Amino acid sequence: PNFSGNWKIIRSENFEELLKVLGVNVMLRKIAVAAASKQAVEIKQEGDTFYIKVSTTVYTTEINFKVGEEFEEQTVDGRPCKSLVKWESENKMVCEQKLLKGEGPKTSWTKELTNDGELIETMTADDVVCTQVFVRE
Numbered sequence: 001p002n003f004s005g006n007w008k009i010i011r012s013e014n015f016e017e018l019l020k021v022l023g024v025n026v027m028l029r030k031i032a033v034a035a036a037s038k039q040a041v042e043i044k045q046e047g048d049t050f051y052i053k054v055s056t057t058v059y060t061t062e063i064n065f066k067v068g069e070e071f072e073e074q075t076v077d078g079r080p081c082k083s084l085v086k087w088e089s090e091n092k093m094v095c096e097q098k099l100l101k102g103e104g105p106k107t108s109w110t111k112e113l114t115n116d117g118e119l120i121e122t123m124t125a126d127d128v129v130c131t132q133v134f135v136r137e
């Protein structure tokens, strides 16, 4: 597949429940939910190497990885982690994260290209899954 593109969010579900698992207090969860509704994802894919820029109104982050090679990033709530991305099918990748220090909930994310041209990203903390849907600009 080709994940490359400038993606804009059209749907964001269960994001508050995810942040609750992660210990975020109520008012910051609501503010974070409003932020998530302005999420944009810019992807440059070259083979199995990915350059991804995730951004809101006031913040932007870069995630660069090669499939199958360990790398460092942060959980959704900012804790540093070790990450490894594997394919699960032609069009979907899965990333498992392990905290660098301390412990916390089990976190992971997935990214998938649908046949309808949608990008579906999920983020998981233990039992709770946030699902986010994007379309190309």
Ligand SMILES: *C/C=C(C)/C=C/C=C(C)/C=C/C1=C(C)CCCC1(C)C
Residues within 6 Å of the ligand: 032, 033, 035, 036, 039, 041, 052, 054, 056, 063, 075, 076, 077, 109, 110, 111, 121
């Ligand atoms: C392949 C796509 C990935 C790994 C995207 C992950 C998305 C995030 C880490 C999103 C984070 C946030 C917002 C969209 C808004 C509020 C602040 C965050 C960190 C919860």
